[PDB]
Design a protein around this ligand. Structure first.
Ligand SMILES: O=P(O)(O)O[C@H]1[C@@H](OP(=O)(O)O)[C@@H](OP(=O)(O)O)[C@@H](OP(=O)(O)O)[C@@H](OP(=O)(O)O)[C@H]1OP(=O)(O)O
Ligand SMILES: [Mn+2]
Lengths: 114, 293, 62, 55, 60, 41
């Protein structure tokens, strides 16, 4: 069956919209996904169908907040982070993570079937 | 400004009903109006309860007249034409002119879908170009009609549960949202979802396959079954390949093929067929034979 | 109550209606030029037949 | 995810796997895996690395 | 190259073109109406003339 | 050179551009005021 509801990441919306802009308006705009006025109606339909199936995951908003913090550091950008056990575990691992990963992979490769 | 061109269109349709074509200027203004009308139609159109679906026509204008005689006149009966209007027939120009004239006049009572033979390449090869030239001594017509074909909706959806489309369905397509999310304002690309909707066809081999036609695929039964279930459709109707009976039930009542051009392949000598969706979405077929010449 | 969506819809629709009216007037002008040519031909034929008739009448005068 | 870079011929050869990909995996709109046409590894890495280390 | 000054000059010149063009259309339209009126009148006069001519032919 | 859809699209994009510029400048002003009061303290 087809159990998965389709998703479309923002990048696809922007790419499609810029393709349509180049094809119908004679000039691309650049990383804007709200300007849809000159395109024909059968394109507004597609844009609506896309943007109503959009899926923005936590990764995108977190990267956005990160670049934000990096932009305005001390205008209230200083944040507190929850100390959920994953966060404390990462605080612990961070110093010597790569050695941990290399060691795990070495043991794995030694334990592969052949 | 409004009833005047309505009367003009009615006169055009009446003239067309006698195998009498139009002047290239008339065709130009007609194609402009038809572009204006078609631009307000999604890639997957919705049609209300009672309709009469007809498939491959292929320029057999006198057989289109016979069809109209069988299933009723233009405004009285709602029609739905699934593509392949113009090639492999002598009266291609008249056929497409009549269908477009209807669509412009009664924009609610008739719906025409794009077909494999609506791309500039296939027409230029198979003959519509030649008839355009012979009957007009130009390509201005064949330019207008192709720039119009680039607007025809790809699919139709009757009562939200019948899926009608020339050709068949594609792997790059999983739900009607996907089709509705395409860009149909271009010539048919050589590979894409468009070059499969208008080129694929069912078959016996389950799952996808390679189409001996050269474009699109050959969706087996399981593909159609899961597509129907995942979209709530009760039946997918199509018309792309000759069926001597007039209409075939492929994939266990999931897919119907309705050829509507009689005596198309003369070695076979098929009989055309059309489907009627009555007030209660119950389909009933009418099979007819070529007109008396 | 000026809103850029309203303004853009207005610009689009008014360019469209000017295009439509342009086509209307151009078609009418084509038809009118055809009628002018027809009336020119008719006047020429009438003048020619009248000249021939009066020429025959003058021959009778001779 | 890698069927685009595998060349039309491969797609033309393996269909049962393409049928399986059709059924099982989620579908992205405007995706071109089924008809795909067609990279700076170290550069993209050293950029992501900078992002990470900044965080 | 798009820009607001260019767009404004564009709209101004284009609106001016549309208006002067509709004006030329109207003057030519009235001209053609009067022209075909005169030529139809000339055709009617030549018709009455041919009628009088055949009448005189029968008379002579 | 031009085209009507071009004009409409460009107008819309310029409006959105000004709005994004306003947001960016507001954030920049917040930051600068923050550094200012920091140095003041
Ligand atoms: O099925 P998808 O829509 O593609 O979900 C995928 C992904 O699946 P894959 O890793 O197999 O590609 C993960 O979902 P799971 O398989 O782990 O269940 C993941 O979710 P997690 O990172 O939390 O594990 C992630 O979802 P998200 O982006 O929200 O993190 C992501 O979604 P995307 O397709 O948008 O990348
Ligand atoms: Mn056909």
């Amino acid at each position: 069956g087809l159990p998965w509801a389709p998703k479309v990441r923002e990048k696809d919306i922007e790419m499609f919209l810029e393709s349509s802009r180049s094809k119908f308006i004679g000039y691309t705009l650049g990383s804007d996904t709200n300007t849809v006025v000159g395109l024909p109606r059968p394109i507004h339909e597609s844009i609506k169908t896309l943007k109503q199936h959009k899926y923005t995951s936590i990764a995108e908003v977190q990267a956005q907040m990160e670049e934000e913090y990096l932009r305005s550091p001390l205008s209230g950008g200083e944040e507190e982070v929850e100390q959920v056990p994953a966060e404390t575990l990462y605080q612990g691992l961070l110093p010597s993570l790569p050695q941990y990963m290399i060691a795990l992979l070495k043991i794995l490769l030694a334990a592969a079937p052949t | 400004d409004e009833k005047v061109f309505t009367k003009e269109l009615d006169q055009w349709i009446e003239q067309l009903n006698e195998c009498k074509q139009l002047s290239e200027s008339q065709v130009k203004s007609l194609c402009e109006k038809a572009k204006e009308i078609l631009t307000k139609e999604s890639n997957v159109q919705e049609v209300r309860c009672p309709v009469t679906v007809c498939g491959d026509v292929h320029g057999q204008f006198h057989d289109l007249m016979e069809l109209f005689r069988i299933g009723g006149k233009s405004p009285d009966t709602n029609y739905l034409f699934m593509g392949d209007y113009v090639d492999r027939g002598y009266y291609s120009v008249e056929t497409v002119t009549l269908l477009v004239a209807l669509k412009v006049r009664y924009r609610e009572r008739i719906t025409i879908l794009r077909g494999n033979h609506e791309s500039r390449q296939i027409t230029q090869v198979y003959g519509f170009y030649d008839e355009c030239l012979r009957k007009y001594g130009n390509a201005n017509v064949w330019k207008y009609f192709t720039d119009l074909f680039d607007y025809l909706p790809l699919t139709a959806l009757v009562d939200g549960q019948i899926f009608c489309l020339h050709g068949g369905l594609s792997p790059s397509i999983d739900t009607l949202d996907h089709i509705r999310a395409l860009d149909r304002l271009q010539e048919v690309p050589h590979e894409g979802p468009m070059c499969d909707l208008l080129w694929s066809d069912p078959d016996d081999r389950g799952g996808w396959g390679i189409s001996p036609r050269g474009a699109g695929y050959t969706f087996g039964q399981d593909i159609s079954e899961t597509f129907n279930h995942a979209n709530g459709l009760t039946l997918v109707s199509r018309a792309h390949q000759l069926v001597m009976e007039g209409y075939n039930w492929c994939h266990d009542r999931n897919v119907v093929t309705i050829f509507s051009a009689p005596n198309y392949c003369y070695r076979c000598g098929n009989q055309a067929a059309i489907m009627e969706l009555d007030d209660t979405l119950k389909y009933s077929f009418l099979q007819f034979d070529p007109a008396p010449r | 109550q000026y809103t850029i969506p309203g303004i853009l819809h207005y610009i689009q629709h008014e360019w469209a209606r000017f295009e439509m009216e342009r086509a209307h007037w151009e078609v009418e002008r084509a038809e009118l030029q055809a009628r002018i040519a027809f009336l020119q031909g008719e006047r020429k034929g009438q003048e020619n037949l009248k000249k021939d008739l009066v020429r025959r009448i003058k021959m009778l005068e001779y | 995810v890698q069927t685009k870079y595998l060349g039309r011929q491969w797609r033309k050869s393996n269909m049962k796997t393409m049928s399986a990909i059709y059924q099982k995996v989620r579908h992205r709109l405007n995706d071109d895996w089924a008809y795909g046409n067609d990279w700076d590894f170290q550069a993209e890495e050293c950029a992501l690395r900078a992002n990470i280390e900044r965080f």
